[PDB]
């Protein structure tokens, strides 16, 4: 098994820089052809570039020349990747992957990174505020919670401390023009219930420290 | 740069039936040294892509042989002998003869069932947000198929645009249906100044468009 591990998410402002790594676990790391892509959540898949730690080989993507700098340590194993000017459609999960040899070498190999996930946006961390969605009119109800103008993501949201996961759809968050994101998530459940059972949603935002449990009563 | 056609955009499929993906590519993919390097991967949600096949017809290891792959110079073909659940996914082509290397935009693989209307519910604003100085009303379109769905709010029956957010869940493992929540934002001032809000849905499986409304404060 060969296996590269990549650094953790970054959040930087428009302007600014980055730099992410990639390290390889495996025997001559030299010989490696290393890939960069990058993707934006929903779309595809953007080839950055490829480079071959054993030589002064780099393939660029000509869109990305000027803002992208491939870079590798030969005595680490790790490869890196520079980006200058970020922009906020520069926004996205990038890989580093290493999948082909040299031509005619036979080899094929499916090895990638975790992805390192980059926000640049101009906005500053900020925890959520917490809205229920609360139910009303022996069938079926609906109910759920308003996670709204956080930053940045993600956030994770359960009900009664997980005990409840049939008939939750957390969606997706959408991006605000105020740069804050927003997600709903939401529960269908026995309206004969909603006298008796107890409806508490857990949210936890991470890069804030906030952690909020909102109960979601009838009326 | 070699551009990568992929068609279709969107495959719904059902379960046991073939499945057959269509990649062109700009300019041939046969190589100076006369190989062909068109690869196919599919793409899990929250995962990276996964390599399927190589060089038009290799399969992978681990992949099994209901996948095939065919074609040549500037058109390829994916196909699956019989779906399966596990097949769902985004496929992508990948060609690795010219610098850049590129990608096609993908096909969405989805599972195919029968027309389910979704259960429409509407939330109003909570008096907790209201006290913040904004009205965030919400509307849910619930365990639903297929995913094409009309979803337009009426504030005292003016037609609304541009104030309000939809996103969809993925496709749900056990019965195939999406669902789907929009958000209509104001604040509490327009907010305020009005009375009947309504969310009207349109979708394959209602005879007619389905409205759900309240009269702002109950
Ligand atoms: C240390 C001395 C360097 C040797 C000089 C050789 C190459 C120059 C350095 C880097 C260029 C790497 C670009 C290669 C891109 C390869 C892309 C690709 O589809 O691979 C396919 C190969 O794995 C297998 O091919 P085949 O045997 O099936 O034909």
């Known amino acids: 098994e060969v296996q590269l591990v990549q650094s953790g998410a970054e959040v930087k402002k428009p302007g600014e820089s980055l730099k992410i790594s990639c390290q390889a676990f495996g025997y001559g790391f030299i010989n490696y052809l290393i890939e960069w892509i990058r993707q934006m959540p929903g779309q595809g898949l953007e080839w950055i570039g490829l480079?071959?730690?054993?030589?002064?080989?780099?393939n660029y993507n000509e869109n990305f020349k000027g803002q992208a700098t491939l870079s590798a340590d030969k005595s680490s194993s790790t490869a890196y990747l520079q980006w200058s000017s970020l922009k906020a459609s520069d926004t996205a999960m990038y890989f580093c992957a290493r999948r082909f040899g040299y031509y005619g070498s036979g080899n094929y190999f499916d090895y990638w990174g975790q992805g390192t996930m980059v926000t640049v946006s101009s906005a500053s961390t900020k925890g959520p505020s917490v809205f229920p969605l609360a139910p009303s009119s022996g069938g079926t109800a609906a109910l759920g919670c308003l996670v709204k103008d956080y930053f940045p993501e993600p956030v994770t949201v359960s009900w009664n401390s997980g005990a409840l996961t049939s008939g939750v759809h957390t969606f997706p968050a959408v991006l605000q023009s105020s740069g804050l994101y927003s997600l709903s998530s939401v529960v269908t459940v026995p309206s004969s219930s909603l006298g008796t059972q107890t409806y508490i949603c857990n949210v936890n935002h991470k890069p804030s420290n906030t952690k909020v449990d909102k109960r979601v009563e009838p009326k | 740069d070699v551009v990568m056609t992929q068609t279709p955009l969107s495959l719904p499929v059902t379960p046991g039936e073939p499945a057959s993906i269509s990649c062109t590519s700009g300019?041939?993919?046969?190589?100076?040294?006369?190989?062909?390097?068109l690869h196919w991967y599919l793409q899990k949600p929250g995962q990276s892509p996964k390599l399927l096949i190589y060089?038009?017809?290799n399969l992978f290891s681990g992949v099994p042989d209901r996948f095939s792959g065919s074609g040549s110079g500037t058109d390829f073909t994916l196909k699956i002998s019989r779906v399966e659940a596990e097949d769902v996914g985004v496929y992508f082509c990948?060609?690795?003869?010219?610098?850049?290397?590129?990608f096609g935009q993908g096909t969405k693989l989805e599972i195919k069932r029968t027309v389910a209307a979704p259960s429409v519910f509407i939330f109003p604003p909570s008096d907790e947000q209201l006290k913040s100085g904004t009205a965030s009303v919400v509307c849910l379109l619930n365990n639903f198929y297929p995913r094409e769905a009309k979803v337009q709010w009426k504030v005292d029956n003016a037609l609304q645009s541009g104030n309000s957010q939809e996103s969809v869940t993925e496709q749900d493992s056990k019965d195939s249906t999406y669902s789907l929540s929009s958000t209509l934002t104001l604040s509490k001032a327009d907010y305020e100044k009005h009375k009947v809000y309504a969310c009207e849905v349109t979708h394959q499986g209602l005879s007619s468009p389905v409205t759900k409304s309240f009269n702002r404060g109950e």
């Open positions: 990948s060609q690795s003869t010219h610098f850049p290397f590129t």
């Open positions: 480079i071959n730690p054993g030589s002064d080989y780099t």
């Open positions: 060089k038009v017809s």
């Open positions: 300019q041939s993919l046969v190589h100076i040294n006369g190989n062909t390097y």
